[PDB]
Design a binder for this molecule. Sequence first.
Ligand SMILES: [Zn+2]
Ligand SMILES: [Zn+2]
Length: 490
Amino acid sequence: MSEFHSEISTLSPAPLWQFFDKICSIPHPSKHEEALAQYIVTWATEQGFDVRRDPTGNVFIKKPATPGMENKKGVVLQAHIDMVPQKNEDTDHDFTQDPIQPYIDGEWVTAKGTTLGADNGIGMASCLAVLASKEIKHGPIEVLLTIDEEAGMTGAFGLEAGWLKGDILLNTDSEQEGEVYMGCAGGIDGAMTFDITRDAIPAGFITRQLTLKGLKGGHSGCDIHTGRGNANKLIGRFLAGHAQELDLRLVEFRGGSLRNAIPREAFVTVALPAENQDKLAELFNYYTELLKTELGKIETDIVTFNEEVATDAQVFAIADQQRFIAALNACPNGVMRMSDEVEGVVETSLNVGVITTEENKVTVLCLIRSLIDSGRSQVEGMLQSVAELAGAQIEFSGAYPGWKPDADSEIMAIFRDMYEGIYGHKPNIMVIHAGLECGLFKEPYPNMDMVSFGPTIKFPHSPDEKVKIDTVQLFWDQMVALLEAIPEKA
Ligand SMILES: [Zn+2]
Ligand SMILES: [Zn+2]
C-alpha cells in the first residue's frame, strides 16, 4: 500500500526470504506438491546434495557437516510442502495454477485475496536457506519435506525408519516466536450405538422438551482442562437419578455438534403423565439451579428451557431407555489423568461430544485424546466395558499417534537454554492437547525426540494469513543458534 516498491526478496534474512519468494511463485496446495517437489530436488541436485525421494512422496536432502562437527549429532529440519487453498470470496485464483502474490504491508507480509502459505513458507524456505548457507557451522544434516499437512497429513506416516539418522528433529510448523512444543495428544474417534425399539406413548402422557444451553462450549482438545460443562452429560445425569422416580419415558435425545467440540447445547424430549408436570418442572428448575451453584464460576450463561410439543412419537422401550441412560451416565468424560512428567498438563481425556437419536438407533459419538498412546487404549477399553455392559456396540477409527513429552530431553534443554542465551528470558515451552504432524513422526523413530517452533503467523488458512516480518529474523536466529549448539554423539 504505502511501501509499494519494497521487495520480498530483500527482507532479512535474504537467502530464506528469496527462497520464500520462489516458493510463492510455484503453486502448491495440498495434493499438488509435484511441481515444487521437483524444483526442490532438481535444485538440490545442482548444488550436489544426495537427494532421494520415498515411495509416498516426501523429500530427503543430505548435507554433511561443516569442518569441525564431523563428530556428528545428526539433525533433521522439517516442514511440509503443501499450502492451504483459500481465496477471498471475490478474486480470481486458480490454486492449481496461479502463484501467490505476496506483498509487504507494515510489520507484516500477506498475499491478497488468498492464503499466503507462510506455513511453512516461512519454515521450509528456512530449511532451504540452511542447505544453501555457506557459513553456519553445523553438524550432519537431513531435511524432511513432507507432503500434505492440511489433507489428513498423508505424508506424515507416509514412510518409516531407515531413512533418517540423528535422534533429533526440528519442526518449523508452530506459529509463534517464543512458543515451543515438546509433545502433543494422539486421538481416536469412538461411536457407541444402540439398537432400540419403540413402544407407544401411554394414555395422558403430556410430552415435553427439556433443553439445556448457553454452555461456553469449546474445543475438546485445547479446552478440556477447564471446568466447562458437557451438555450431553448434564441432561443424562438428570434422567439418571430421576427418570424412574418421575416415571417419564424417552423419545428424543440430541446434543452437541461434532466430537471436536465440547457440546454446549443438548436436549431431550420426553413423555410423562400430566400429573408429574409441575413436579418435573420444579425438579428440573431445581436441577438447573444447582447447576449454576456448581458451574456458576466458569459457566456464566447457563440456561434451560422446558416447553412441550406433544407429538407422536413412539417412546423408547423401557429396557432400551434404561441401558442407554446407565451407559451415558456411567461413561467417563473430561480429563482422565494429568501428566506428571510436565507441570500441570492433561495426559488423557475424552469428550462425549455428539448424541443423535433416530427411529431404532441411538448413537453416542466421542473422541479420546492422549499424549501417552498407552493411555488412549486404556480409555478405549473402559468405553468397551461400558458398551459391553449395556448391550451396545462401539467402533473405533480415525486413530493417530501422540507425542509423549520427555522432560529435560537434550534438545528441549538446549533450546531452552540457547534461547535464554539469545533472549533475556525463556520461551513459552508447551504441550497441546491436539494433533500435530511431528506426532505421527513418533510412530517410527520413537528414539527421536524433537521440537516445534517457528515465526509468528496470524490467521493461517484464511485470506488474512499475515506473517510478522521481524520474527522471521528471530525464527532464523535460533534456527541457527541451536543448529550449532547441538552436542556430539560418538
Ligand atoms: Zn497449516
Ligand atoms: Zn502447518
